Design a protein around this nucleic acid. Structure first.
Lengths: 262, 206, 151
RNA sequence: CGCUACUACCGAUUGGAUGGUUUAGUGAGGCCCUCGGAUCGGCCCCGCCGGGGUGCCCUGGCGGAGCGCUGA
RNA sequence: UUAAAGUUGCUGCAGUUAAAAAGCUCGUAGUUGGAUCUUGGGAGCGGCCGUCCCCUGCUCGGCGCCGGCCCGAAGCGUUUACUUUGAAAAAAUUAGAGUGUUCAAAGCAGGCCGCCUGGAUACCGCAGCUAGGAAUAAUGGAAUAGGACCGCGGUUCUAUUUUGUUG
RNA sequence: UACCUGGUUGAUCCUGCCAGUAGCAUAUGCUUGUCUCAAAGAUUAAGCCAUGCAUGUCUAAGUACGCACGGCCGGUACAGUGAAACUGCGAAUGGCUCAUUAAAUCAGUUAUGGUUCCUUUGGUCGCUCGACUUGGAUAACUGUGGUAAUUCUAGAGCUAAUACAUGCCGACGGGCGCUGACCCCCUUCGCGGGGGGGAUGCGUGCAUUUAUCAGUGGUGACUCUAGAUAACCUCGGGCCGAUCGCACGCCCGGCGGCGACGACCCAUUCGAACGUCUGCCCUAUCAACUUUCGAUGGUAGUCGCCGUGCCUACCAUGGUGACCACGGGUGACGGGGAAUCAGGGUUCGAUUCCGGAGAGGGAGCCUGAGAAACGGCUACCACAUCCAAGGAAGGCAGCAGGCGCGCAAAU
């Protein structure tokens, strides 16, 4: 390869893009943006598979540049725009908004939210920088460079930004006893409380997260998103509240639903 | 077609390796600058990323430093006297990084009388004729004379630097690569540098 | 003992020609020494603090950083200057015949003159660096003596 | 030992041929440097006017450039 | 070309006579190496035992009190292989859960009268990173005491909180 | 389904091999009614190709005086559509093949604290103290020509820019540092000392480079970022907007809303590239190999986007090897995987997904962010097309197709 790739095969797509095999050779390669290729979700994939508003690749384009869809308060006219974690998407005419949260399994889930919760967005700070004339800077996980932050924002905190002004309203400090969830790996979408944080000099610093029912698991430092201060979550959690039901309880719940439905 | 690969040559065990792919474009090399002296010529070449690197072919002046009291002035290149790498590169007037040259002593001298108000150079038998510095000495107040007196209470330097100042040339070193940025910066040689490189010159020229 | 070659050897962090008030005695002629903590729980020795050697590839007094892997080995030969070769003996497993084989892969690491109390057979540990030569990639962090050598 | 067939082997012909390494010598083309200056522009004098300003400048050209400067 | 081939034999072949122990011995690299180091006890359940807890030391603090106690922690604790757990380890494919493509190879669909879903899981040899135990196998502590421990005795470089404001 | 059977003898028991038995994937032969999937010139030839096609592109926003069309009161400028052409972007993606390549490629695991990054996303874009819009050239077009011939082109006459260039006003009145004429207050009589105003002159920020000093925020760790001083700032030259469209306008000519394009720097996204640890088939009728034609390391440089014998000048004789180096062969691209399979294994993997290599084979290069590109260019040899014989034009291991080669593979 003499340059960057511009195509992407269907079976080379990530599994959480949640496609089929016998439809086409290629898959939608997203345009470059705030999020990585294997951690985002194209707008065409959502509008054509999840919401079922469109069936072909031209109907998605018509809806997309018809100026009907707004992305974090800004209208976007790219059908392969990368949408990732807590990307607030809004439809102005039928009055629906969706928040992208990983569910109990390894995928995205549709989650309708009220507009009052659609005005803000929780996002994770990545690194702290100092500008030219002594301006402190923040680099956010969706590449939002924010000037003049609060002095108590550290490396692995979570800030809440209003989508109309771009400023910080409130923040959550990285500490034990806070509600957390994991973004990537074998664990995905489980909601838990940070207990331990093991420090290894020169490598990945693993942590330990306990679920609300008695389960525990260990993830890396980069696989951390802090969502709450204590037990109350700052956003509306999806169905099941991220408990990671095992296969026996899942089978029992499906059998109970089948017996009750008839 | 000059390459910079690490597959034209033998391995650690001494066995030859067989090349499988030809010369690439990131693997590139260019001929040497051979930065001479004379009227200034500088060429630009486009490199990876679209940037430009200034190839200094000839140059006249340089921005050197004199660190005993931290002054920097633009100073003309006079002559190259020593090169630690090649003994041919003194016979051809070439400029490289960490090279040993002589530069003119005039602007540092003017800074020395204009700051410390002590005579520098000006060997005995010929005094200050054109009558400029004692004009600056006069029409001062008592506070300003007290400030100069407290400043020139300590006005001592190395004797070898003084002998270079009567000689009119200061032995200087280059701390910049002229084939990459296009300029010839650096700092003047002082202290143990002077005695070491003077020992090297007197050993080589003998 | 120092300044052997055709160029001056210096540490380009400090300034060795600071102008004192007197330039005589009682406060001069003790040059500062540049050193840093390499991290990873390792402690810098006194020989890198009060020494007089000059290097550019020393992990303590130099311009090289420590990151990546931490390995170990046994010193085999000290013939080429300022760098040594160590031997790593490891066991390889075969799935078919459920029995091990020992293998050795000797490779060259860098020895600064800070550790000059090194004989053949001393156990050393190394840390990964940027390539300092054609075949040299590692810097020795500490030295451990072998059995015997009570003198 | 006598007869038929076959397989490789030794071997004169220092047979024929296809690939590679290489002594020495030649070496097209491109690239870098030093030169080279065909050709093309701009300002000051001669010639005509219409001048406000109170015989002099702003306004338009060719023939010699005066091979003067300078740029590609 | 694979199984049958226990006719390639690590599991798992043969060497007196059927094919096969070098004429004999020493010997380097390789492979393999004896015994020996903490046993035994207590609070109790089912009625002596198959499941429960106990037999590494030190500079700062929150679960509680009246300069005095416990809990925790910035930071260190002889190293290996082996063993169990954890991270990450692309998809398709291999097992495998769901689903009347009329069955099956398939495929990821579909079912009720706008509503409800699924699109799991395991495996991924070895090597690198981690956390409970040291039975198994190999190294080392002191024998020229340059061995521990305890409080004393001499030689040096540097820290602002101070000898009435300031030098 | 963890399995056996016939053959040496007059007959018996054995070692042992031969032959049966089953699957698998290549070909061939005979035969053939329905329906659902599906490989297909890879082995021998990485051998050669006629012909046709495969990479082009316009919105309410770069340039429109082609009546090629068309709206009118034409006369203060265009209703609008527009082939052509300039400008900008993409052709470096995709597709085909397995020739080279045996610690090389590749696989898992790390690092860039050792560097560049088109586009998108976010920030910066009156921080600098010093024109109510400038210049001349070329297209398209008109007219006139040569060669037998090409996606070949010269002289002549106009004309545009988000093409090539040259560049100001405002912000902008005072701040921060050196030099400072000088002025003022006092026990100390002045003298000596202590403390405040300072006109004038120079430099000012970001991007590059050198030199010195201190130690907002961070790492396990900087010669890290930020701060200060003194300068530099390349004529082939860093930025600080001489660009375009829609909807309408308030307040006495000034002043406003949403966009499109372009731009130094910074992070991010896509990555690429160089390195760390471990793991590759056979062969001793290959036992020593490399070594001033760099082999191993040190010093200082050149070049490169960066570290590094990558390369120069000087030093020491180093480095690998019976635990198989080196040398040779391969009917060797590597892996995810396929067949058979009680338990262990054996064989294959040219082939749809990932990474690498090449476009006859070596060599060199322009443009561009990204190419040593071949549906880009330049010379060599092998081969080969047309011709008025002077010259001109190319590389199907892309899609169809043809020849050769073949046991062997389609419109």
């Amino acid at each position: 390869a003499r340059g960057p790739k511009k195509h992407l095969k269907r079976v080379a797509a990530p599994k959480h893009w949640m496609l089929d095999k016998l439809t086409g050779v290629f898959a939608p390669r997203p345009s470059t943006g705030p999020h990585k290729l294997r951690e985002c979700l194209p707008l065409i994939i959502f509008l054509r598979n999840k919401l079922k508003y469109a069936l072909t690749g031209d109907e998605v384009k018509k809806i997309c540049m018809q100026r009907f869809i707004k992305i974090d308060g800004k209208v976007r006219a790219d059908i392969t725009y990368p949408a990732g974690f807590m990307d607030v998407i809004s439809i102005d005419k039928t009055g629906e908004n969706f928040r992208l949260i990983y569910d109990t399994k390894g995928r995205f889930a549709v989650h309708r939210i009220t507009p009052e919760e659609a005005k803000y967005k929780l996002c994770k700070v990545r690194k702290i920088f100092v500008g030219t004339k002594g301006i402190p800077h923040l680099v956010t996980h969706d590449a939002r460079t924010i000037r003049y932050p609060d002095p108590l924002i550290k490396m692995n905190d979570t800030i809440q930004i209003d989508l109309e002004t771009g400023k910080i309203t409130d923040f959550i400090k990285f500490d034990t006893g806070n509600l957390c969830m994991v973004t990537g790996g074998a664990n995905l979408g489980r909601i838990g409380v940070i207990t331990n944080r093991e420090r290894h000099p020169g490598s990945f610093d693993v942590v330990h997260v306990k679920d609300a029912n008695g389960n525990s698991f260990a993830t890396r430092l980069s696989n951390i998103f802090v969502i709450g201060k204590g037990n109350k979550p700052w956003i509306s959690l999806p169905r099941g509240k991220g408990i990671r039901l095992t296969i026996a309880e899942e089978r029992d719940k499906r059998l109970a639903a089948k017996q009750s439905s008839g | 077609g000059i390459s910079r690969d690490n597959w034209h040559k033998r391995r650690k065990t001494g066995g030859k390796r067989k090349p499988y792919h030809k010369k690439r474009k990131y693997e590139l090399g260019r001929p040497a600058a051979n930065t001479k002296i004379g009227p200034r010529r500088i060429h630009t070449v486009r490199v990876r990323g679209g940037n430009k690197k200034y190839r200094a072919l000839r140059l006249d002046v340089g921005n050197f430093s004199w660190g005993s009291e931290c002054c920097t002035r633009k100073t003309r290149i006079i002559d190259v006297v020593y090169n630690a790498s090649n003994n041919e590169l003194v016979r051809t007037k070439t400029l490289v990084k960490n090279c040993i040259v002589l530069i003119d002593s005039t602007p540092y001298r003017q800074w020395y009388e204009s700051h410390y108000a002590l005579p520098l150079g000006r060997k005995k038998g010929a005094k200050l004729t054109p009558e400029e510095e004692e004009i600056l000495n006069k029409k001062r107040s008592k506070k300003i004379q007290k400030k100069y007196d407290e400043r020139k209470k300590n006005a001592k330097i190395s004797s070898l630097l003084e002998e270079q100042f009567q000689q009119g040339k200061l032995l200087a070193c280059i701390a910049s690569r002229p084939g990459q940025c296009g300029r010839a910066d650096g700092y003047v040689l002082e202290g143990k540098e002077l005695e070491f490189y003077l020992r090297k010159i007197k050993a080589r020229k003998g | 003992d120092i300044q052997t070659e055709r160029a001056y050897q210096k540490q380009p962090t400090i300034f060795q020609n600071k102008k004192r008030v007197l330039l005589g005695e009682t406060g001069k002629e003790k040059l500062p020494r540049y050193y840093k903590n390499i991290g990873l729980g390792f402690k810098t020795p006194k020989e890198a603090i009060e020494g007089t050697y000059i290097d550019k590839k020393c992990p303590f007094t130099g311009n090289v950083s420590i990151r990546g892997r931490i390995l170990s080995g046994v010193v085999t030969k000290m013939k080429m200057q300022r760098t040594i070769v160590i031997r790593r003996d490891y066991l390889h497993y075969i799935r078919k015949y459920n029995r091990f084989e020992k293998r050795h892969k000797n490779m060259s690491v860098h020895l600064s003159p800070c550790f000059r109390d090194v004989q053949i057979g001393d156990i050393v540990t190394v840390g990964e660096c940027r390539p300092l030569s054609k075949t040299v990639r590692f810097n020795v962090l500490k030295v451990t003596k072998a059995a015997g050598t009570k003198k």
